[PDB]
Every structure is written in C-alpha cells, then in structure tokens.
C-alpha cells in the first residue's frame, strides 16, 4: 500500500549534499527560510511522485533524495 510507519522496515536518508547546495543557492540571492523550506519540500514531493509512479500505490529497501532531484526543483 505504500503506507509508512515511523511489509519491510525500510530506512530513508536525506542526502545533506543536496541540502548543502540548496542552502548555498538560497543564501546567495536571498537567504530566506521560507524559500529554502519550500524548495526542499518541492524536491521531496518530486522524489515522492517518482517513487509512487515506480510502484503505483495510488491515493486511498532504502530511500534517498539524489542531488538531481533538488537540482530540478531549484532550477
């Protein structure tokens, strides 16, 4: 079902390098908490929809967030 509870115990890593690059880019032009939070959320949900599509859970081993996700979401 794709449900998550904080049937396999999966783990997830939020690669702090993409976080680094997003922080760098935002601190460059503006350095705003709202913008940074929102772009992080954006990349997160992009990876989310890709993972959903790859398995098709609909709406009723180990996960990560590559640099490429935040690259797209920020561009």
């Amino acid at each position: 079902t794709g449900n998550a509870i904080l049937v396999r115990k999966v783990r997830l890593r939020m690669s702090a390098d993409a976080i680094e690059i997003a922080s760098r880019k935002v601190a460059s032009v503006s350095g705003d908490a709202r913008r940074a939070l929102k772009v992080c959320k954006r990349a997160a949900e992009i990876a989310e929809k890709h993972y959903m599509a790859k398995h098709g859970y609909g709406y009723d081993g180990v996960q990560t967030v590559h640099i490429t996700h935040v690259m797209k979401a920020l561009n």
Binding site: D17, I21, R24, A27, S28
Partner: protein, 191 residues
C-alpha cells in the same frame, strides 16, 4: 591640444633661450645633420624602392582587422575617427615601406611595420587623459580561479571531488596548500 603644463613651459622655454645662448638646439648627445647633405642622403634613400616582406602580411592584415573593428564600436563614441578605411591600411603599408627605405633594406621588418602601427596609434588617444591602468599583476589565487573558470567553460560543474583541478594546479606550479585555502574561500564564497 596644448595642455598647459609646467615642465613644458619650463624646458621648452629654457631651451629656446638656450638657443639664444647656443644657436644649436643639439645638446651634449646629438648629431645634427646639415640640410644639404641631409637632403643628399634622403634622395639617395628615395632612389631605392624596397620590397614588401611576405611574413609581416598576416600581422599587417590582422592589424587592419583590429583597426577596423574597434572603429565601429568607436563611431559614435569619444574618439570619433569614423570607420578606418582600406586607405588607412594602404597608408600603413606605405609608411612601413618608407621606414624600410630608411633602413636602406629591400625587406620590410616586423619591427618596421610595428613602428608604423605605433605611429598610427600615437596619433590616437592623444586627446585626453593619456593614461591607462593595470590590475592583473597579483593573481596568487585569482589565477587559480581563472583556471577553474576555463574548466567551467569546458563543463560547468561545482563538484565535490577535485582531481583534474588539482592536477592542473600542480601543472601550474601553485602548491596544494594555497589551492586548498582558495577552495575553502570559494566554497565559503558559495561557488
């Protein structure tokens, strides 16, 4: 344009008065030639007809190109000498040929045509300021930065693993401690 200065009105005036004292402007180091035998040598030179050297052409050509392009971006600008013409190129060639006559040599030198270019450009920028500046001397880390910029022109990545960068730095001779310092600075500088 006679900029009213002080050292000019000093030296020029002094030396005119010195002419009144000593009727020869030539000072301690000078070889003035009487106009008669001067004329003699000059005509002798005029009876030579040297030849254009084949090597300089490209350079000459390139000079023209330069003297062309700037002219366009200088048309409405300050130095409003408009759109240097092929006659300017031909005049440069003629000046080079005459200097080669002064060499009494039948092949024009690269220094010859370079002197001609110096003449044609000294005619210019003699209007105002007559000065320039230099900034790129230091370059103890900015040089590394420019090398990085060429590399970025190649690909354009802000990677987290530098192996061709360190190789090119070592080829450049700059040490790795200064390189790592600069990398620190630019990462903090957010690039």
């Amino acid at each position: 344009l006679d900029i009213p200065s002080r050292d000019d009105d000093e030296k020029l005036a002094e030396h005119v008065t010195y002419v009144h004292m000593h009727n020869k402007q030539p000072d301690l180091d000078f070889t003035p030639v009487e106009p008669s035998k001067m004329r003699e040598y000059i005509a002798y030179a005029k009876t030579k007809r040297p030849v254009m050297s084949e090597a300089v052409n490209d350079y000459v050509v390139q000079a023209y190109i330069r003297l062309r392009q700037d002219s366009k971006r200088e048309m409405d600008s300050k130095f409003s000498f408009g759109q240097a013409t092929p006659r300017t190129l031909l005049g440069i060639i003629r000046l080079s040929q005459a200097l080669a006559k002064l060499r009494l040599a039948d092949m024009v030198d690269i220094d010859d045509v370079e002197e001609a270019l110096r003449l044609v450009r000294v005619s210019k920028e003699s209007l105002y300021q007559e000065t320039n500046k230099s900034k790129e001397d230091e370059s103890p880390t900015t040089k590394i930065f420019t090398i990085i910029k060429k590399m970025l022109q190649e690909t354009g990545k802000n990677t987290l693993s530098y192996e061709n960068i360190v190789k090119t730095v070592r080829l450049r001779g700059f040490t790795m401690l200064q390189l790592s310092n600069c990398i620190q600075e630019y990462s903090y500088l957010n690039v």
